[PDB]
Design an enzyme around this catalytic site. Sequence first.
Site, mmCIF file in Angstrom:
data_model
loop_
_atom_site.group_PDB
_atom_site.id
_atom_site.type_symbol
_atom_site.label_atom_id
_atom_site.label_comp_id
_atom_site.label_asym_id
_atom_site.label_seq_id
_atom_site.Cartn_x
_atom_site.Cartn_y
_atom_site.Cartn_z
ATOM 1 N N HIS A 39 0.841 -1.190 0.000
ATOM 2 C CA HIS A 39 0.000 0.000 0.000
ATOM 3 C C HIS A 39 0.869 1.231 0.000
ATOM 4 C CE1 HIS A 39 -3.296 -2.651 0.899
ATOM 5 N NE2 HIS A 39 -2.673 -3.102 1.992
ATOM 6 N N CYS A 89 -4.504 4.729 -2.714
ATOM 7 C CA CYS A 89 -3.426 3.763 -2.814
ATOM 8 C C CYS A 89 -3.226 3.435 -4.292
ATOM 9 C CB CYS A 89 -3.831 2.509 -2.064
ATOM 10 S SG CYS A 89 -2.644 1.155 -2.215
ATOM 11 N N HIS A 92 -3.607 -0.435 -5.469
ATOM 12 C CA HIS A 92 -4.988 -0.914 -5.356
ATOM 13 C C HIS A 92 -6.004 0.127 -5.771
ATOM 14 C CE1 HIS A 92 -2.882 -3.519 -2.227
ATOM 15 N NE2 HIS A 92 -3.106 -4.266 -3.295
ATOM 16 N N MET A 97 -9.387 1.688 -3.334
ATOM 17 C CA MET A 97 -8.722 1.857 -2.062
ATOM 18 C C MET A 97 -8.373 3.322 -1.918
ATOM 19 S SD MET A 97 -5.776 -0.366 -0.142
ATOM 20 C CE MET A 97 -5.399 0.123 1.570
HETATM 21 CU CU LIG Z 1 -3.486 -0.537 -1.064
#
Ligand SMILES: [Cu+]
Length: 104
Positions: A39, A89, A92, A97
């Site tokens: 992340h 993020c 993702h 996200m």
């Molecule tokens: Cu992430």
Amino acid sequence: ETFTVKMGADSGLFQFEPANVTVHPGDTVKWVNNKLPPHNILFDDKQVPGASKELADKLSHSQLMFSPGESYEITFSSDFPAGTYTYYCAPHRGAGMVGKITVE
Ligand SMILES: [Cu+]
Ligand SMILES: [Zn+2]
Ligand SMILES: [Zn+2]
């Protein structure tokens, strides 16, 4: 007050938890790397108050976090502009996200 945001849900979802946090001047937001890495935490220039790239860049943690428990924090001191700080993020991004910190 310190508010903790999990990066990755305990149940294996690519989400910040909680995604939305309201803070007051002097509070800290602490991101903790939980599940399903990597992340990171990115603020686009037009997604912070006044659309300041200087501010957005200082707050962004573009480097990838892989190990459980790795952390990054921002203390939203009185010298931060009030308003919304929306982040995402990159790894993702397609999973939505994303999150938002509202100061004041
Ligand atoms: Cu992430
Ligand atoms: Zn941009
Ligand atoms: Zn208030």
